[model samples]
Target: ITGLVYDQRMMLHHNMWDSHHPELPQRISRIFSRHEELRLLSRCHRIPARLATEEELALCHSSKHISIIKSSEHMKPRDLNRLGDEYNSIFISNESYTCALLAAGSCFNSAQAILTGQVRNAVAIVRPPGHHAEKDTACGFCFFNTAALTARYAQSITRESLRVLIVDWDVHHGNGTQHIFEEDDSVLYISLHRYEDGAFFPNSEDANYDKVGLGKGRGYNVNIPWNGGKMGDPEYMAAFHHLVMPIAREFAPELVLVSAGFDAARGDPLGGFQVTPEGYAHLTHQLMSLAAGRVLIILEGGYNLTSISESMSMCTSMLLGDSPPSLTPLKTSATVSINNVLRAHAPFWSSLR
Candidate 1:
């Protein structure tokens, strides 16, 4: 059976970078409403979420960063808005700290469920997306890196070494998650995002294709940057078959985690991709084949309410072991960019060659 984690506290209104920003409370509400309409919630094992303690938050965050988040409890809305402006897309509210903690905790709980074999796979639907928050800095509507902390916590709970493969399919690169484990070989971080030669959000040198990893972590970090948008299932599936699957099988991770951002779904204003709900189901199916079907999906980004909700419904359905809907045959096209990625890592991984 599939396990699910969510909490009402995630719906608390956290202020936006601007009044008209897309990140808002309604995002989660709309998703839940659609989930209920689809009767997806009742089909899975529901898991409860709690607040992540200071110690747990410290697993992947600096003490100073943790303190900064804690201090936001007393800030008024006006002060919080100013702080958000100062820090890019990080908006805070009186309840934001609580919501952020719950969001982080939801991911931890889902990971635990997978570790205990309570379910074959699980998904944590949370908000205040964490993939963009670095160890000490919060940006892109993220307060803490939930997926990174989940990886650390999963390793802590198991006695043996746990190799985790984090596949970030968010429209934008998971800069914070990459930063936390860029030098660690134990966690293989692979990201497929829109790069446009580093002009994307969190537009830093780190998002480039060659920023693989440092020291022993070399070749462990894989980046498949799409130089332009309008990418669809054919391009994505080609990358998976050509690059992700081969390297992942070679890595042979003990557990798999996905930064499941449906923003790449068709019609997302920010992501600007053509991935459909069926495409997400196929992606989930491919990853489920690894780690003995042990996977934990954590929510990161997705704006357009209908697309996100529909995409999530498809994901939840796949986790329940339901066969995904069939797709119409489309002309298969070659991807030279994917070829470039394969060649880039040929020296590091035997699977690439």
Candidate 2:
């Protein structure tokens, strides 16, 4: 059982928007501290601690953006003031660069281990999360494009021309990842996110279903944008039945990478959607079946500790082919939310030619 240690060094208390909550590391630590057994057992799954070099990050990001993050490593106290307003809780002390590097490297190595037969499956439990980071800029607490960079790295060393499919179900849309590959055919980017016109960050007017991939990549980019109040198991299951399964089959991908964020789980503070712990497991089960178990689950964004750990346990259970984890009955609110999502996104899926 491969479990990525949610890297400790990358934890930050600062935020761009002054979020009223603990930093990521504190939240991750809280979860592991409560589940010491899982922490101890995680050692068996340990691969080497790896960090993505500047050149590796350049695979999916611009050199300018990459340089900016690196240069921030030694910013003076006053100089830090020059950073933008969005850099609110994203403080970078002396050691932050090293920690972030280690986290990103481990993510890259996790992908390599899974694809190279070193491990049947792997998890990259690292942060700051990567889905929100784009080719040229960073937002939503993410500094690097871990999954995107990993996919690019896989292509570099592989013999076959691999088709990479990234499934982003982070509640919040992965606008950055979409922007990077929206026009590329080799990588199919699919998102199941909460959409409210431009209420969300990185709001893209072009994220509509009709905005399929341009040129050769047409029909490759699938956006199943869910409604804000419509989150629950039924709608999530509908997402599987309607969005995830169909597009994945049509894409016929060789490897599947999930932007596994537990924030959407019912009761998560950061998530407006209503997925439950079992919902995440069920989603994993469905994705595993579709990918023939050739799927890599990378941690994205989940804030509430109890729900996050439960969701992780569910995912780990499915990855190991065990019976689903013991979970409370799916909540009633989630069901109603699912219905709303089905009705709202109905036409979008049918028109996804």
State TM-scores per candidate: 0.95, 0.85
91-144 per-residue lDDT for model 1 (tens digits): 788888888899988888888888898888998888878899889988888988
What TM-score does structure 1 among the candidates reach? 0.95
Per-prediction tally of clashes: 0, 13
Model 2, residue 217: displacement in angstroms?
1.5
**Top of the candidates by lDDT:** 1
Give the runs in model 1 whose Cα sits over 4 Å from its true position.
16-19, 328-334
Per-residue lDDT tens digits for candidate 2, residues 154-178, read 8877843578889988887787788
* Model 2 spans with C-alpha error above 4 angstroms: 1-5, 12-23, 31-35, 38-44, 84-91, 325-353
lDDT of 1: 0.85
